[PDB]
Amino acid sequence: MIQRTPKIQVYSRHPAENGKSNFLNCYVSGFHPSDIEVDLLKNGERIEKVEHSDLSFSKDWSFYLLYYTEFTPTEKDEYACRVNHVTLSQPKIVKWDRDM
Amino acid sequence: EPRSPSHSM
Amino acid sequence: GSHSMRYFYTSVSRPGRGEPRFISVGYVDDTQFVRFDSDAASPREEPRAPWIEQEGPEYWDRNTQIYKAQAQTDRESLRNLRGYYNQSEAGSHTLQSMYGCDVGPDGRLLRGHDQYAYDGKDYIALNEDLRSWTAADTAAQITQRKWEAAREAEQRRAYLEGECVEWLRRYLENGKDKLERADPPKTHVTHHPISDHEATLRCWALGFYPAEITLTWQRDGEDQTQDTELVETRPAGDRTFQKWAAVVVPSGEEQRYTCHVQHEGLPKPLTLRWE
Ligand SMILES: [Cl-]
Ligand code: NA
Protein backbone atom coordinates (compact mmCIF):
# COMPACT_ATOMS: atom_id res chain seq x y z
CA MET A 1 0.00 0.00 0.00
CA ILE A 2 1.28 3.47 -0.95
CA GLN A 3 2.10 5.84 1.92
CA ARG A 4 3.19 9.43 1.22
CA THR A 5 4.35 11.86 3.91
CA PRO A 6 2.47 15.23 4.03
CA LYS A 7 4.16 18.47 3.00
CA ILE A 8 3.13 21.38 5.24
CA GLN A 9 3.13 25.10 4.73
CA VAL A 10 1.84 27.59 7.31
CA TYR A 11 1.09 31.14 6.22
CA SER A 12 -1.46 33.97 6.28
CA ARG A 13 -4.04 34.72 3.58
CA HIS A 14 -2.87 38.37 3.42
CA PRO A 15 0.54 39.84 4.44
CA ALA A 16 0.38 40.14 8.20
CA GLU A 17 -0.29 43.55 9.78
CA ASN A 18 -0.42 43.60 13.59
CA GLY A 19 -3.97 44.26 14.80
CA LYS A 20 -5.61 43.62 11.41
CA SER A 21 -7.97 40.65 10.89
CA ASN A 22 -6.54 37.95 8.60
CA PHE A 23 -6.68 34.17 8.04
CA LEU A 24 -4.12 31.68 9.25
CA ASN A 25 -3.66 28.76 6.87
CA CYS A 26 -2.03 25.37 7.17
CA TYR A 27 -1.84 23.64 3.77
CA VAL A 28 -1.10 19.89 3.95
CA SER A 29 -0.52 18.17 0.64
CA GLY A 30 1.05 15.21 -1.13
CA PHE A 31 -0.12 12.69 1.51
CA HIS A 32 -1.64 9.18 1.41
CA PRO A 33 -3.69 7.64 2.94
CA SER A 34 -6.23 10.45 3.57
CA ASP A 35 -6.58 10.01 7.35
CA ILE A 36 -4.75 12.97 8.97
CA GLU A 37 -5.02 15.18 12.03
CA VAL A 38 -4.23 18.87 11.75
CA ASP A 39 -4.43 21.42 14.55
CA LEU A 40 -3.68 25.13 14.54
CA LEU A 41 -1.98 26.31 17.73
CA LYS A 42 -1.93 29.74 19.35
CA ASN A 43 0.86 30.06 21.93
CA GLY A 44 0.99 26.27 22.06
CA GLU A 45 -2.75 25.76 22.68
CA ARG A 46 -5.21 24.16 20.26
CA ILE A 47 -7.43 26.70 18.45
CA GLU A 48 -11.03 25.52 18.74
CA LYS A 49 -12.83 26.86 15.68
CA VAL A 50 -10.79 25.54 12.76
CA GLU A 51 -12.29 24.68 9.36
CA HIS A 52 -10.88 22.79 6.38
CA SER A 53 -11.40 22.54 2.64
CA ASP A 54 -13.15 19.52 1.16
CA LEU A 55 -10.88 16.50 0.59
CA SER A 56 -9.35 16.62 -2.91
CA PHE A 57 -6.26 15.23 -4.62
CA SER A 58 -3.62 15.82 -7.27
CA LYS A 59 -2.88 14.00 -10.48
CA ASP A 60 -0.58 11.57 -8.64
CA TRP A 61 -3.58 10.68 -6.38
CA SER A 62 -1.98 12.34 -3.29
CA PHE A 63 -4.39 14.26 -1.11
CA TYR A 64 -4.42 17.91 -0.04
CA LEU A 65 -6.36 19.96 2.50
CA LEU A 66 -6.27 23.57 3.65
CA TYR A 67 -7.00 24.11 7.36
CA TYR A 68 -7.75 27.70 8.30
CA THR A 69 -9.02 30.12 10.93
CA GLU A 70 -9.73 33.85 11.20
CA PHE A 71 -7.09 35.53 13.39
CA THR A 72 -5.67 38.96 14.21
CA PRO A 73 -1.84 38.73 14.39
CA THR A 74 0.11 40.57 17.10
CA GLU A 75 3.79 41.08 17.88
CA LYS A 76 3.84 38.54 20.69
CA ASP A 77 1.32 35.83 19.66
CA GLU A 78 2.94 32.64 18.33
CA TYR A 79 1.16 30.40 15.82
CA ALA A 80 1.90 26.93 14.50
CA CYS A 81 0.39 23.97 12.70
CA ARG A 82 0.59 20.46 14.19
CA VAL A 83 0.13 17.45 11.91
CA ASN A 84 -0.19 13.74 12.70
CA HIS A 85 -0.23 11.12 9.96
CA VAL A 86 0.66 7.42 9.74
CA THR A 87 3.89 8.37 7.95
CA LEU A 88 5.07 10.58 10.85
CA SER A 89 6.71 8.92 13.85
CA GLN A 90 5.71 11.91 15.91
CA PRO A 91 3.53 15.02 15.35
CA LYS A 92 5.12 17.50 12.96
CA ILE A 93 4.95 21.12 14.14
CA VAL A 94 5.63 23.99 11.74
CA LYS A 95 5.69 27.49 13.12
CA TRP A 96 4.08 30.43 11.35
CA ASP A 97 6.61 32.99 10.10
CA ARG A 98 4.96 36.14 8.75
CA ASP A 99 7.80 36.48 6.22
CA MET A 100 7.16 33.10 4.62
CA GLU B 1 -22.83 17.86 -13.51
CA PRO B 2 -21.55 14.41 -12.42
CA ARG B 3 -21.72 11.26 -14.53
CA SER B 4 -24.37 8.62 -13.77
CA PRO B 5 -23.08 5.80 -11.50
CA SER B 6 -20.72 3.24 -12.99
CA HIS B 7 -21.01 -0.53 -12.68
CA SER B 8 -19.00 -1.81 -9.74
CA MET B 9 -15.38 -2.88 -10.25
CA GLY C 1 -9.44 29.97 -23.57
CA SER C 2 -9.02 26.20 -23.06
CA HIS C 3 -10.88 24.85 -20.04
CA SER C 4 -11.40 21.62 -18.10
CA MET C 5 -14.00 20.10 -15.80
CA ARG C 6 -13.07 17.38 -13.26
CA TYR C 7 -14.83 15.37 -10.57
CA PHE C 8 -12.74 13.67 -7.84
CA TYR C 9 -14.25 10.95 -5.65
CA THR C 10 -12.65 9.38 -2.62
CA SER C 11 -14.11 6.32 -0.87
CA VAL C 12 -12.48 4.98 2.25
CA SER C 13 -13.56 1.73 3.88
CA ARG C 14 -13.78 1.40 7.68
CA PRO C 15 -14.85 -2.25 8.32
CA GLY C 16 -16.66 -2.57 11.63
CA ARG C 17 -17.59 1.13 11.69
CA GLY C 18 -20.21 1.12 8.93
CA GLU C 19 -20.29 1.84 5.19
CA PRO C 20 -17.29 3.56 3.50
CA ARG C 21 -17.11 7.31 3.64
CA PHE C 22 -17.66 8.82 0.14
CA ILE C 23 -16.57 12.39 -0.69
CA SER C 24 -16.83 14.05 -4.10
CA VAL C 25 -15.64 17.46 -5.23
CA GLY C 26 -16.11 19.06 -8.64
CA TYR C 27 -13.80 21.62 -10.32
CA VAL C 28 -13.87 23.92 -13.33
CA ASP C 29 -10.18 24.58 -14.03
CA ASP C 30 -8.74 25.50 -10.62
CA THR C 31 -12.07 26.51 -9.09
CA GLN C 32 -13.97 24.05 -6.88
CA PHE C 33 -17.72 24.51 -7.37
CA VAL C 34 -19.48 21.52 -5.73
CA ARG C 35 -19.04 18.95 -2.96
CA PHE C 36 -20.81 15.94 -1.48
CA ASP C 37 -19.99 14.07 1.71
CA SER C 38 -21.74 10.78 2.64
CA ASP C 39 -21.17 11.47 6.33
CA ALA C 40 -22.96 14.85 6.32
CA ALA C 41 -26.14 15.16 8.45
CA SER C 42 -28.34 15.16 5.32
CA PRO C 43 -25.95 14.40 2.42
CA ARG C 44 -26.58 16.49 -0.68
CA GLU C 45 -24.56 18.17 -3.40
CA GLU C 46 -23.65 21.65 -2.11
CA PRO C 47 -22.40 24.78 -3.94
CA ARG C 48 -18.77 25.82 -3.36
CA ALA C 49 -18.60 28.70 -5.90
CA PRO C 50 -21.08 31.63 -6.24
CA TRP C 51 -21.77 31.14 -9.94
CA ILE C 52 -23.21 27.62 -9.50
CA GLU C 53 -25.86 28.76 -6.97
CA GLN C 54 -28.14 29.85 -9.82
CA GLU C 55 -28.75 26.23 -10.95
CA GLY C 56 -32.33 25.21 -10.14
CA PRO C 57 -33.56 22.53 -7.63
CA GLU C 58 -33.74 19.78 -10.23
CA TYR C 59 -29.95 20.10 -10.73
CA TRP C 60 -29.11 19.62 -7.03
CA ASP C 61 -31.68 16.84 -6.63
CA ARG C 62 -30.40 14.83 -9.62
CA ASN C 63 -26.77 15.23 -8.59
CA THR C 64 -27.47 14.23 -4.97
CA GLN C 65 -29.10 10.96 -6.04
CA ILE C 66 -26.16 10.20 -8.33
CA TYR C 67 -23.63 10.61 -5.51
CA LYS C 68 -25.71 8.43 -3.12
CA ALA C 69 -25.79 5.65 -5.72
CA GLN C 70 -22.11 6.00 -6.60
CA ALA C 71 -21.23 5.71 -2.92
CA GLN C 72 -23.04 2.37 -2.77
CA THR C 73 -21.32 1.26 -5.99
CA ASP C 74 -17.92 2.26 -4.60
CA ARG C 75 -18.75 0.23 -1.47
CA GLU C 76 -19.31 -2.80 -3.73
CA SER C 77 -16.08 -2.08 -5.65
CA LEU C 78 -14.08 -1.88 -2.42
CA ARG C 79 -15.49 -5.26 -1.38
CA ASN C 80 -14.59 -6.71 -4.80
CA LEU C 81 -11.03 -5.30 -4.81
CA ARG C 82 -10.06 -6.59 -1.37
CA GLY C 83 -11.23 -10.00 -2.69
CA TYR C 84 -9.18 -9.66 -5.91
CA TYR C 85 -6.07 -8.82 -3.86
CA ASN C 86 -6.76 -11.44 -1.16
CA GLN C 87 -6.67 -8.71 1.50
CA SER C 88 -7.94 -8.80 5.10
CA GLU C 89 -11.62 -7.85 5.54
CA ALA C 90 -10.61 -5.91 8.67
CA GLY C 91 -8.48 -3.18 7.10
CA SER C 92 -9.21 0.25 5.61
CA HIS C 93 -8.59 0.81 1.87
CA THR C 94 -9.07 3.76 -0.50
CA LEU C 95 -10.70 3.91 -3.92
CA GLN C 96 -10.23 7.19 -5.80
CA SER C 97 -11.94 8.16 -9.08
CA MET C 98 -11.06 11.13 -11.34
CA TYR C 99 -12.93 11.98 -14.54
CA GLY C 100 -13.80 14.90 -16.80
CA CYS C 101 -13.18 16.75 -20.05
CA ASP C 102 -10.70 19.22 -21.55
CA VAL C 103 -12.09 21.58 -24.20
CA GLY C 104 -10.48 24.11 -26.53
CA PRO C 105 -11.61 27.75 -27.08
CA ASP C 106 -14.47 26.69 -29.38
CA GLY C 107 -15.83 24.50 -26.57
CA ARG C 108 -15.22 21.18 -28.38
CA LEU C 109 -13.80 18.15 -26.57
CA LEU C 110 -10.03 17.87 -26.79
CA ARG C 111 -9.47 14.98 -24.38
CA GLY C 112 -11.65 12.86 -22.04
CA HIS C 113 -10.49 11.33 -18.71
CA ASP C 114 -11.87 8.52 -16.55
CA GLN C 115 -9.49 6.78 -14.19
CA TYR C 116 -9.09 5.14 -10.79
CA ALA C 117 -6.56 4.38 -8.08
CA TYR C 118 -6.68 1.79 -5.32
CA ASP C 119 -4.69 2.54 -2.12
CA GLY C 120 -2.96 5.39 -3.94
CA LYS C 121 -1.80 3.32 -6.96
CA ASP C 122 -3.13 3.56 -10.54
CA TYR C 123 -5.65 0.74 -11.04
CA ILE C 124 -7.58 1.19 -14.31
CA ALA C 125 -7.96 4.08 -16.78
CA LEU C 126 -10.05 4.80 -19.90
CA ASN C 127 -7.74 5.32 -22.88
CA GLU C 128 -7.63 8.54 -24.91
CA ASP C 129 -9.68 6.77 -27.59
CA LEU C 130 -12.55 6.69 -25.02
CA ARG C 131 -13.32 3.12 -25.95
CA SER C 132 -10.65 0.86 -24.37
CA TRP C 133 -9.12 0.41 -20.90
CA THR C 134 -5.61 0.11 -19.52
CA ALA C 135 -5.45 -2.19 -16.45
CA ALA C 136 -2.47 -1.98 -14.10
CA ASP C 137 -2.49 -5.66 -13.07
CA THR C 138 -4.42 -8.95 -13.18
CA ALA C 139 -6.87 -7.67 -10.52
CA ALA C 140 -7.65 -4.66 -12.71
CA GLN C 141 -8.04 -7.07 -15.66
CA ILE C 142 -10.98 -8.58 -13.83
CA THR C 143 -12.52 -5.12 -13.65
CA GLN C 144 -11.65 -4.57 -17.30
CA ARG C 145 -13.40 -7.71 -18.52
CA LYS C 146 -16.45 -6.86 -16.41
CA TRP C 147 -16.56 -3.32 -17.83
CA GLU C 148 -15.94 -4.56 -21.39
CA ALA C 149 -18.96 -6.88 -21.13
CA ALA C 150 -21.09 -4.14 -19.58
CA ARG C 151 -20.10 -1.67 -22.34
CA GLU C 152 -18.95 0.76 -19.64
CA ALA C 153 -16.59 2.57 -22.03
CA GLU C 154 -19.58 3.51 -24.22
CA GLN C 155 -21.34 5.01 -21.14
CA ARG C 156 -18.17 6.93 -20.20
CA ARG C 157 -17.64 8.20 -23.77
CA ALA C 158 -21.25 9.39 -23.99
CA TYR C 159 -20.81 11.48 -20.83
CA LEU C 160 -17.36 12.84 -21.72
CA GLU C 161 -18.45 13.87 -25.25
CA GLY C 162 -21.93 15.07 -24.25
CA GLU C 163 -22.99 16.16 -20.75
CA CYS C 164 -19.36 16.94 -19.77
CA VAL C 165 -18.77 19.29 -22.71
CA GLU C 166 -22.23 20.91 -22.50
CA TRP C 167 -22.28 21.54 -18.75
CA LEU C 168 -18.71 22.92 -18.75
CA ARG C 169 -19.87 25.31 -21.49
CA ARG C 170 -22.77 26.35 -19.24
CA TYR C 171 -20.61 26.95 -16.17
CA LEU C 172 -18.23 29.05 -18.26
CA GLU C 173 -21.20 31.17 -19.43
CA ASN C 174 -22.45 31.57 -15.84
CA GLY C 175 -19.03 32.05 -14.20
CA LYS C 176 -18.10 34.71 -16.76
CA ASP C 177 -15.09 36.73 -15.64
CA LYS C 178 -14.48 34.50 -12.59
CA LEU C 179 -13.63 31.61 -14.94
CA GLU C 180 -12.67 33.25 -18.24
CA ARG C 181 -10.39 36.10 -17.12
CA ALA C 182 -7.12 35.30 -15.31
CA ASP C 183 -6.42 37.32 -12.14
CA PRO C 184 -2.78 38.54 -12.20
CA PRO C 185 -0.67 38.31 -9.04
CA LYS C 186 -0.02 41.25 -6.71
CA THR C 187 3.79 41.19 -6.54
CA HIS C 188 6.45 42.63 -4.25
CA VAL C 189 10.08 42.00 -3.19
CA THR C 190 11.10 41.86 0.45
CA HIS C 191 14.62 42.06 1.89
CA HIS C 192 15.80 40.34 5.07
CA PRO C 193 19.43 40.75 6.28
CA ILE C 194 20.96 37.47 7.51
CA SER C 195 24.28 38.99 8.62
CA ASP C 196 26.62 41.89 7.74
CA HIS C 197 27.52 39.95 4.62
CA GLU C 198 24.31 38.22 3.42
CA ALA C 199 20.64 39.04 2.82
CA THR C 200 17.56 37.24 1.51
CA LEU C 201 15.53 38.71 -1.36
CA ARG C 202 12.08 37.15 -1.47
CA CYS C 203 9.82 37.64 -4.49
CA TRP C 204 6.08 37.34 -3.66
CA ALA C 205 3.11 36.60 -5.91
CA LEU C 206 -0.26 36.84 -4.15
CA GLY C 207 -3.93 36.62 -5.10
CA PHE C 208 -3.45 35.14 -8.60
CA TYR C 209 -5.72 32.80 -10.60
CA PRO C 210 -5.30 30.29 -12.14
CA ALA C 211 -2.58 28.51 -10.12
CA GLU C 212 -0.03 28.09 -12.94
CA ILE C 213 2.81 30.64 -12.52
CA THR C 214 6.57 30.93 -12.98
CA LEU C 215 8.80 32.89 -10.56
CA THR C 216 12.52 33.08 -11.19
CA TRP C 217 15.40 35.14 -9.83
CA GLN C 218 18.05 36.35 -12.23
CA ARG C 219 21.48 37.77 -11.53
CA ASP C 220 22.46 40.11 -14.38
CA GLY C 221 19.68 38.50 -16.40
CA GLU C 222 20.87 34.90 -15.86
CA ASP C 223 18.53 32.42 -14.13
CA GLN C 224 19.71 31.47 -10.61
CA THR C 225 18.11 28.01 -10.78
CA GLN C 226 20.51 26.15 -8.48
CA ASP C 227 20.36 28.90 -5.81
CA THR C 228 16.61 29.75 -5.62
CA GLU C 229 14.37 28.51 -2.81
CA LEU C 230 10.88 28.15 -4.28
CA VAL C 231 7.78 27.16 -2.31
CA GLU C 232 5.04 25.03 -3.82
CA THR C 233 2.11 27.10 -5.05
CA ARG C 234 -0.47 27.26 -2.26
CA PRO C 235 -4.15 28.30 -1.89
CA ALA C 236 -4.89 31.61 -0.14
CA GLY C 237 -8.29 30.19 0.88
CA ASP C 238 -10.31 32.72 -1.17
CA ARG C 239 -9.98 30.86 -4.56
CA THR C 240 -6.62 32.60 -5.33
CA PHE C 241 -3.07 31.21 -4.97
CA GLN C 242 0.28 32.33 -3.58
CA LYS C 243 3.90 31.56 -4.34
CA TRP C 244 7.31 32.95 -3.50
CA ALA C 245 10.90 32.52 -4.57
CA ALA C 246 13.93 33.56 -2.50
CA VAL C 247 17.67 33.96 -3.07
CA VAL C 248 20.44 34.74 -0.63
CA VAL C 249 22.79 37.43 -1.92
CA PRO C 250 25.92 39.28 -0.73
CA SER C 251 25.05 42.53 1.05
CA GLY C 252 25.49 45.40 -1.37
CA GLU C 253 24.83 43.29 -4.49
CA GLU C 254 21.00 43.33 -4.32
CA GLN C 255 20.90 45.65 -7.40
CA ARG C 256 22.16 42.85 -9.64
CA TYR C 257 19.07 40.71 -8.91
CA THR C 258 15.68 40.82 -10.59
CA CYS C 259 12.59 38.67 -10.10
CA HIS C 260 10.68 37.54 -13.19
CA VAL C 261 7.01 36.66 -13.11
CA GLN C 262 5.04 34.88 -15.81
CA HIS C 263 1.26 34.57 -15.28
CA GLU C 264 -1.65 34.37 -17.79
CA GLY C 265 -3.28 37.30 -15.97
CA LEU C 266 -0.36 39.67 -16.65
CA PRO C 267 -0.29 41.83 -19.81
CA LYS C 268 3.39 40.96 -20.18
CA PRO C 269 6.01 39.14 -18.02
CA LEU C 270 6.95 41.31 -15.02
CA THR C 271 10.46 42.21 -13.89
CA LEU C 272 10.64 43.21 -10.19
CA ARG C 273 13.46 44.37 -7.96
CA TRP C 274 13.96 45.45 -4.37
CA GLU C 275 12.48 48.95 -4.28
CL1 LIG D 1 5.59 27.00 6.24
NA1 NA E 1 2.06 9.31 13.30
Author numbering:
A (entry chain B): 0 to 99
B (entry chain C): 1 to 9
C (entry chain A): 1 to 275
From the paper:
Here we describe a mechanism by which an HLA-B*0702-specific acute myeloid leukemia phosphoneoantigen, pMLL747–755 (EPR(pS)PSHSM), is recognized by a cognate T cell receptor named TCR27, a candidate for cancer immunotherapy. Here we describe the crystal structures for TCR27 and for HLA-B*0702 in complex with pMLL747–755 or similar peptides. Our data show that non-covalent interactions between the epitope phosphate group and TCR27 are crucial for TCR specificity.
The wild-type (WT) MLL747–755 (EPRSPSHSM) peptide is encoded by the human gene histone-lysine N-methyl transferase 2A (KMT2A), commonly known as MLL. To exclude the influence of different crystallization conditions on protein conformation, we generated fully isomorphous (having the same space group and very similar unit cell parameters) complexes between HLA-B*0702 and the following peptides: MLL747–755, pMLL747–755, DOT1L998–1006, pDOT1L998–1006, E7P-MLL747–755 and OSE-MLL747–755. TCR27+ T cells displayed a dose-dependent increase in activation markers in the presence of pMLL747–755-treated T2 cells, whereas no activation was observed in the presence of MLL747–755. By contrast, the pMHC complexes with WT peptides MLL747–755 and DOT1L998–1006 did not interact with TCR27 (KD > 2 mM). In structures with WT MLL747–755 or DOT1L998–1006 peptides, no protein atoms interacted with the hydroxyl groups of Ser-P4. When perdeuterated 15N-labeled HLA-B*0702/ MLL747–755 complex was used as a negative control, no significant interactions with TCR27 were detected, as no changes were observed in CSPs or peak intensities in comparison with the NMR spectrum of the binary complex alone.
